[model samples]
Target: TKGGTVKAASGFNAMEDAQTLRKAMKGLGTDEDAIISVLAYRNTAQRQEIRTAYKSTIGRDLIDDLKSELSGNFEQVIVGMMTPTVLYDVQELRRAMKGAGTDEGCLIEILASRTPEEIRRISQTYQQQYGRSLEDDIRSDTSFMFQRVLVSLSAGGRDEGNYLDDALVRQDAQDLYEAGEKKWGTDEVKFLTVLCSRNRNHLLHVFDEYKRISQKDIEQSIKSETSGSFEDALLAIVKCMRNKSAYFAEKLYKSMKGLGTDDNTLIRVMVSRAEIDMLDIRAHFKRLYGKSLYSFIKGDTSGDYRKVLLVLCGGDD
Candidate 1:
């Protein structure tokens, strides 16, 4: 779990929040402040309640109204607030796959971080939202061993237990080492089996034993063996195994550091991680980059987009 900052608001008045939201957008000009104030403070469940109330009370779709009334990152954040988190994730996954070229980083970042339960939830939500199976989409969009990795991930079968078997850890680590650097042709299936089947704590131990056995880190070994998105997918999983918060911190940094900001990426990390371990991510950001996440967002972004992102960030580290 992310151990996020967002929580259910106590004494929530869904109708009241809904009515205020309607009023905020009803008049000649929009009350953007009111929109942000109402939506930002409430957790996803509360916001959905507000959406239901908005439709029943005002006889209108709350999300549609917000879409019409708002624009840019503000709209993005408001829409994000309205949707349930898993559904939001489903939409992102679909978007990643919809275009001509695939966004492997976005897909890897999201899928690698989610729990088995959450991935199962995303699978269900994907069909409900997009009228398509996520697995089918993956099979069609990708090819080779990379396709197999993604399909296994979408299968939502990561072992979720906490029991760390020393013997199994040793075996898995040895297999991973032998499969990668020790072999002529890499046995990607073996690597995939260990990475996908082990629980996070067990994976950590596997990595520990792996480094000791190979005299090189698992990530280093994967680099030497694989290439392209397959390499990226494996590396992302290994990083997530080590420290998810730190991995996410680095992801957020990637979104903003290049020629121009990847707005979708920035919005995804900032908004999605907000309720989860965004605070931890911010600390990781500082540790990784020697700067605050807030400071980086401020420097790279501007306007209401910046405002919504900063607010979702839950303040400077």
Candidate 2:
């Protein structure tokens, strides 16, 4: 959905981005919340550029900042964003958690769920770095059932193609309708699973099913069908899928526009989604509304809200 050949939108080059980041990092000198705001939610390419930038401009390493700035799973999460080669070099730290004190949740989430290709790369890198196999550590640290799963997965048994079944998509949509429209109210679970867990491709399929059989866009269907929190939840699913991240963007404007705003909605979207899919949120805002998300936001909301969002949107990378 980010589309082919997509690049970061921020004007800042990797060097500039890195300097800005290191300057912001409490890991080195200043506070680091701003650095996290940019780095945490972005993809691997964005990360590399930023890391390279840190070296070119500041003559220091981003990883040093990472070590000082973060710890535990929070650290693991940042490390997870790094290149696999960098991940391989971090084995000394990973080794500390092994033998008698493994970080199993990190193991499960990172090692267990990573694709076969990822596991293979990690395994190869671990062997090269520690003179120990990733599989060995994986087996030593992980549960038996998961050990078998991970080893088999490392052997390259993972699915290579899209698993989204159009039939399954239809069923999920029907199930969603039944949960929200047919009952006293909709089931939030059904909505959450489909909207969040399902990929955009599958969501497209779901949207098709909802339109053809339900004869309505999911939002219209939900609005007509449910009430109260249930309605809000269903709409959340629909609107999230719709690419009007400006939906929230619009809400931010309205909150401060006239008299008082819906503080709940305002705080919720702005605070919760400051970085989460916000790039997509901003991108969606432009795609749907034919204007820059920033421009619209500037015209409406003011004060700290405006400043924060503008800074957050700086990544045209």
Candidate 3:
């Protein structure tokens, strides 16, 4: 914060709120971990309200006021909790350490493991906040194992979803086909409604079954059987499901992995998914890929960027 820029993000809004509570913990100093632990499990929106209320109730710059009360890993952990995205905060902290040629034990512990999707989003979010891509910063800053971890996260890959079966899926698939490929072959609103509404798990099975019954792939069926926007709508269903990795992974891949990363989208996905069903998706990624999604992240990224990513990956790391 010495000369740091403020990122325009709701995630930031949430973390700052949590910092207010942290300010109160300084007197006990040793209690930093307890406060951070409480904060880690809470949602951004909830944290925001609590932090704002705490500050209004107590009246002070929480982080500014608390620095004197604690030090070391405990302080870093508490400071990390005040960050909108924990992984990014850790990365920045690690970077600050490594840049000074210091031994960053806290950074080492925090960044050792994290999945591709989590790492990707954190990089994206960090860039959005700091005006530099997470990968770019790592390229200029960190190196070796630390560097490897950050860049791996920026690669933007993760697990595909799992499978599920349901009668509703068949109905959804049939309706989707009718909306796009059957007869006149075009009704976009209907296609979107049917395809998007189906439970994600159920749709996985439906994709295969739809192909079997239609005698062609869903997208091709739409292409051959329909026309105009309806064809596009149906095509979206097929493409989006081809390798779904929960919502955030998809967002990160689109916004941060290509020639130019989408930092805004990256932040949205990571912050939103930090504590959601991404855990299940990470497992699903393992079921499909043989390697954990985190492994892919480790292979692609580097430095503090990777450190932040491991925290977001939702792994014990």
Candidate 4:
């Protein structure tokens, strides 16, 4: 079975959780712990139910209450938890492309890793929610090969099956070699087509064949051939194809590393992955980084923010 830290709560009572949330935020001093205990422990569906029940029982928006009661990263996490999974993704994409400079990392993290179906839903939801096409926004905000990668992903056309063709795999591998290490200059379109459209299992075979053909990892070739956001997008797709959980582990590591944490990334990854493969991500974190995600989060942050994140972390590796 797949690993996820947060699962359906035992003896779940949506109305009770709603009332508890109401009581927690009702008082002059908000019980941040109470908020954490209810929201953090529950999976996304449970949280949504609580939101609906809160509206029915209290006649006020639950998110509005939380927004009023809390502030800073804590509020962001809580509101993110309350948002529907698809809408949360749409909102994040909007935020990434909204102002000043685009958060290319955010765009890469999402579009590169989501399933074909998930990408389709996110694109559809983006249109409905923002009255604009995700692909159009991506094209406007990014340029060249990076924009192409995002648009390819946004099209939701990646092969999703596990069925593999040996000949096609070999051809793809040789194609990649010709496009990059085997050629005078990089043919980025070939790399983009192979990386963006192939099924994960098929891509794994291609990667193996690529190593044999190029005598180097595909990632190494991509780094040498491409630079900046283009390189990052290519690497993300390759890495995710290899191991999605490990991909997220590395992302989480980068988010919390160095002087200041990228709280946006930390929150998005934690909240987005909590009900999915967080247990696997945690295991990969310890395996890849030699430290528990729990410990890093605990050390890097403090107060209610840290508490909520730890709750989602499930436990120490």
Top candidate, metric TM-score:
4
Cα-based TM-score, every candidate:
0.92, 0.41, 0.41, 0.96
lDDT of 2 by residue, 1-317 (tens): 33211234565466666766776763445454566566644545677777877777888888887777765434544554454333532353265346687644334323323445656676667667678766666667655433454444345444344578877888988887786654455565566456545655677778888888867788776676555533553454455445445455554555545665443334334433443455666676666567665675456556534444455444432
| lDDT tens readout by residue for model 4, 257-294 | 88889999999999999989999999899999998999
Ranking by lDDT: 4, 1, 2, 3
Off by over 4 Å in 1: none
* Weakest ten-residue segment in model 4 by summed lDDT: 176-185
Which ten-residue region of model 3 has the weakest summed lDDT?
Answer: 1-10
Number of backbone collisions per candidate, in order? 2, 11, 19, 0
Q: For model 3, what is the alpha-carbon lDDT of residue 196?
A: 44
lDDT for every model?
0.85, 0.55, 0.49, 0.91
Q: What is the lDDT of residue 150 in candidate 1?
A: 86
Compare candidates 2 and 4 on TM-score and give the better one.
Answer: 4
Q: Which stretches of candidate 3 lie over 4 Å from their true place?
A: 1-42, 53-58, 61-190, 196-209, 217-248, 253-257, 287-291, 295-306
Strongest candidate by lDDT: 4
lDDT for residue 211 in candidate 1, whole number 0-100: 83
Alpha-carbon RMSD, each predicted model: 2.1, 11.2, 15.6, 1.4
